PDB file of C-alpha atoms in Angstrom:
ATOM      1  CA  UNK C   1       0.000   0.000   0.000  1.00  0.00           C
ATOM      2  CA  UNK C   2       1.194   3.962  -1.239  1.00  0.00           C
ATOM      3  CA  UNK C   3       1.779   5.470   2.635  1.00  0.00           C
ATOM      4  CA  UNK C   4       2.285   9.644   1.979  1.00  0.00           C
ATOM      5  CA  UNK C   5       4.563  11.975   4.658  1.00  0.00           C
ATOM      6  CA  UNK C   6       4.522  15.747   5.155  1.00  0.00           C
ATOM      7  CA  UNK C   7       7.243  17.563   6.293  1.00  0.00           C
ATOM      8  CA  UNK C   8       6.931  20.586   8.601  1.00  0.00           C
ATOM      9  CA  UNK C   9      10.674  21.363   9.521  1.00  0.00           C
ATOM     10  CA  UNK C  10      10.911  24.817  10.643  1.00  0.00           C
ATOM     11  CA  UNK C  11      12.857  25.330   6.795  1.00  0.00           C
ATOM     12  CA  UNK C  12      12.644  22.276   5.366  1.00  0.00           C
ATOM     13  CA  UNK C  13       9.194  21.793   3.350  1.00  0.00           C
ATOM     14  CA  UNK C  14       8.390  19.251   1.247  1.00  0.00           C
ATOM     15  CA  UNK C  15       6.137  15.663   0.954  1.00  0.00           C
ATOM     16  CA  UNK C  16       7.130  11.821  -0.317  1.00  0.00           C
ATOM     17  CA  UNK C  17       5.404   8.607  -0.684  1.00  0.00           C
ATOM     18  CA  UNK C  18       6.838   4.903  -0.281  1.00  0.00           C
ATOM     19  CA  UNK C  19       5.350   1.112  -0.489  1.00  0.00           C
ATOM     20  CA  UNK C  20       5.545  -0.857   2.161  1.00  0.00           C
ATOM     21  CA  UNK C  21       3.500  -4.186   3.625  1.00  0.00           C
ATOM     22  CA  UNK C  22       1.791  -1.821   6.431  1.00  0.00           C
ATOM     23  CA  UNK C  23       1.729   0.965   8.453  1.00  0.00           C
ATOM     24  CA  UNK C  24       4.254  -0.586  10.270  1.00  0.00           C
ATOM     25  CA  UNK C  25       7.088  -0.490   7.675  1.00  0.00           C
ATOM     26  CA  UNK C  26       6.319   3.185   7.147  1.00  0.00           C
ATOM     27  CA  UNK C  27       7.106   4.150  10.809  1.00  0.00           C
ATOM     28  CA  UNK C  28      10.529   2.656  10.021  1.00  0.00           C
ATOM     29  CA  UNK C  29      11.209   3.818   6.673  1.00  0.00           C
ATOM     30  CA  UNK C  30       9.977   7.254   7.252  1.00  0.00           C
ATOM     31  CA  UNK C  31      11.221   7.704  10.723  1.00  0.00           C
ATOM     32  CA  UNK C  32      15.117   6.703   9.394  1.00  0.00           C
ATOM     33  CA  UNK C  33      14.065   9.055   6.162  1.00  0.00           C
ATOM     34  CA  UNK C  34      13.438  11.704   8.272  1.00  0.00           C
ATOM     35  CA  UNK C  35      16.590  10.959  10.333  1.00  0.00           C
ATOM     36  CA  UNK C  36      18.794  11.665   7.605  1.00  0.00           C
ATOM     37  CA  UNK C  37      17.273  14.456   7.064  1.00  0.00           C
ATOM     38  CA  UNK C  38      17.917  16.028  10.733  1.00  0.00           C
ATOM     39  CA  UNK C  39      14.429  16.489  10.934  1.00  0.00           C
ATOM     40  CA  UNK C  40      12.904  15.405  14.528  1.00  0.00           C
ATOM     41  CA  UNK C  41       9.379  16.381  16.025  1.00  0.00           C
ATOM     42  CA  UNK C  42       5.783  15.017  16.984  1.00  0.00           C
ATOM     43  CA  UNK C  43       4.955  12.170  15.033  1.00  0.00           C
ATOM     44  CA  UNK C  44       1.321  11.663  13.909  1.00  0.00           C
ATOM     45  CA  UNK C  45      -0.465   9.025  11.744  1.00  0.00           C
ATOM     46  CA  UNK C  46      -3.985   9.018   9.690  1.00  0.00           C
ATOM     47  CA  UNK C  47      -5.232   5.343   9.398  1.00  0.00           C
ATOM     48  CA  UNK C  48      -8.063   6.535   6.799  1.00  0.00           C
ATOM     49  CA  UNK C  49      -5.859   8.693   4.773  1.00  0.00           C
ATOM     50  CA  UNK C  50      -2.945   6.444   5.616  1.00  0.00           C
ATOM     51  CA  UNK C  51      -0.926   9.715   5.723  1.00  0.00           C
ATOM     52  CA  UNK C  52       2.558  10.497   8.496  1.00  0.00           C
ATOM     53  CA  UNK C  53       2.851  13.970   9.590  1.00  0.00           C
ATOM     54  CA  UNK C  54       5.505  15.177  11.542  1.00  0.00           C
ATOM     55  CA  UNK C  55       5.679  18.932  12.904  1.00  0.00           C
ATOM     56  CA  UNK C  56       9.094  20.315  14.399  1.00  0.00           C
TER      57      UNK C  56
END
């Protein structure tokens, strides 16, 4: 299943979307993803739009 993250860094902007088996997967992938990017915050997720947020 398509899984979509926003990014709200305080300057960094932007969205991306990966595969993965679950919802599980994405907390990984996304959570590392944001990692390299030095971006760390609140971390939210929408079951029905299957959508990760995180705000810094």
């Amino acid at each position: 299943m398509t899984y979509k993250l926003i990014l709200n860094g305080k300057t960094l902007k932007g969205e991306t979307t990966t595969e993965a088996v679950d919802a599980a997967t994405a907390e990984k992938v996304f959570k590392q993803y944001a990692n390299d990017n030095g971006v760390d915050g609140e971390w939210t997720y929408d079951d029905a739009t299957k959508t990760f947020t995180v705000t810094e």
